[PDB]
């Protein structure tokens, strides 16, 4: 690196939490000094509260300003529900179909293919179900998931491995359900 | 299942003596937009979002100014206590399954660190590469540490090796995260 001067960080977070669409909305404003949250306003509480002793004077000082408080107490409507309405169509309601592929892999360097991997990628939202079949019969044991990986670009991926050493005549199926499709996507593979 | 909770977070920060500030919105862990401080502009994470919403960047600059003024007050109040360095964990993966000679993207995922100052270098066969690279701003975490992504478009090959080199004040030496084609899983 370089320049080891000491650092001083302040973070502000306004968290709008939404449950069942906008049936319940909660604002949590959080003030953080050096990774240490010091003070917050929770709309369910309705005034500032000190999280550590460092934040107390702010709590007291801001709670003393009646017009600032009334603004924050209205923020669930004027800020949270407003912004939910602005972004909903391209965020909450975003649907992108997954790409599915199956390829063989190995648990250890050198030894032969002892896995089938079903890669599910490019999809949004995160809700996905993956099932493995060998000759149309579901494989339950030996199935292992990475779970959900966020790519940083409004897509996810996940890898679902089946422990198996494929033999000729076996047809393996990866089947995938996701909100973007009304029937399951299936991809077949054979050795 | 239909997802029950969603969270939108407007996350800001100011860091001294760097004098670097950031303003961004996060939805369920993905960046909706940030404001570029030098250019003073709203930058939407996907170009198409800006066809649907707008954001006045000048307001974000005003917030960062208040945030600056509070940081300085807090810095005295805490009697100049500095942030403790927390070094990142790094993961490199591809965004799609790797096929020989089919264009792909390497993803360097830098996680669980603070302060938000990091150097990331893509190395192909031990030599820096910059062609086509892109990166995100710092993204928030519930524990108040940061996330970041860097991206390297590439053409998979049996001959090339890659390293994401990450440097940070909390690391003794640069962290080298290796990737190559056909690695076991």
């Amino acid at each position: 690196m370089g320049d080891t001067r000491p650092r001083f960080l302040w973070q502000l977070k306004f968290e709008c939490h939404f449950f069942n669409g906008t049936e319940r909305v909660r604002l949590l404003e959080r003030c953080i000094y050096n990774q240490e949250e010091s003070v917050r306003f929770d709309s369910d509480v309705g005034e500032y509260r000190a999280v550590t002793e460092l934040g107390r004077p702010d709590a007291e000082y801001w709670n003393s300003q009646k017009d600032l408080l009334e603004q924050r107490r209205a923020a669930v409507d004027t800020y949270c529900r407003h912004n939910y309405g602005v972004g909903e169509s391209f965020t909450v309601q975003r649907r992108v179909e997954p790409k599915v592929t199956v390829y063989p892999s190995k648990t250890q360097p050198l030894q032969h293919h002892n896995l089938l991997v079903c890669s599910v990628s490019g999809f949004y939202p995160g809700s996905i179900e993956v099932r493995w079949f060998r000759n149309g019969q579901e494989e339950k044991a030996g199935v292992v998931s990475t779970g959900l990986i966020q790519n940083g670009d409004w897509t996810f991926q996940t890898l679902v491995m089946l422990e198996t050493v494929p033999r000729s005549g076996e047809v393996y199926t990866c089947q995938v359900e996701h909100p973007s499709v009304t029937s399951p996507l299936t991809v077949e593979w054979r050795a | 299942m239909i997802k029950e909770e969603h969270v939108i977070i407007q996350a800001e920060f100011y860091l001294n003596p760097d004098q670097s500030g950031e303003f961004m919105f996060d939805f369920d862990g993905d960046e909706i937009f940030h404001v570029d401080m030098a250019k003073k502009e709203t930058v939407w994470r996907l170009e198409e979002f800006g066809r649907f919403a707008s954001f006045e960047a000048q307001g974000a600059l005003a917030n960062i100014a208040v945030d600056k003024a509070n940081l300085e007050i807090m810095t005295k109040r805490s009697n100049y206590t500095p942030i403790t360095n927390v070094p990142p964990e790094v993961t490199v993966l591809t965004n799609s399954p790797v096929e020989l000679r089919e264009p792909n993207v390497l993803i360097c995922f830098i996680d669980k660190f603070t302060p938000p100052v990091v150097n990331v270098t893509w190395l192909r066969n031990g030599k820096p590469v910059t062609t086509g690279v892109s990166e995100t701003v710092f993204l928030p975490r519930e524990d108040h540490l940061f996330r970041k992504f860097h991206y390297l478009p590439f053409l998979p090959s049996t001959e090339d090796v890659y390293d994401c080199r990450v440097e940070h004040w909390g690391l003794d030496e640069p962290l080298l995260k290796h990737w190559e084609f056909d690695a076991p899983s």
């Binding site: 004077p57 702010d58 602005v86 | 649907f52 919403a53 707008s54 006045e56 509070n70 007050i73 807090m74």
Partner: peptide, 17 residues
């Protein structure tokens, strides 16, 4: 017609002296 995303504004801390 683009919707405006709103920002919330941080409160100033009390000056030290």
């Amino acid at each position: 017609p683009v919707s405006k995303m709103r920002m919330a504004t941080p409160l100033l801390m009390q000056a030290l002296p």
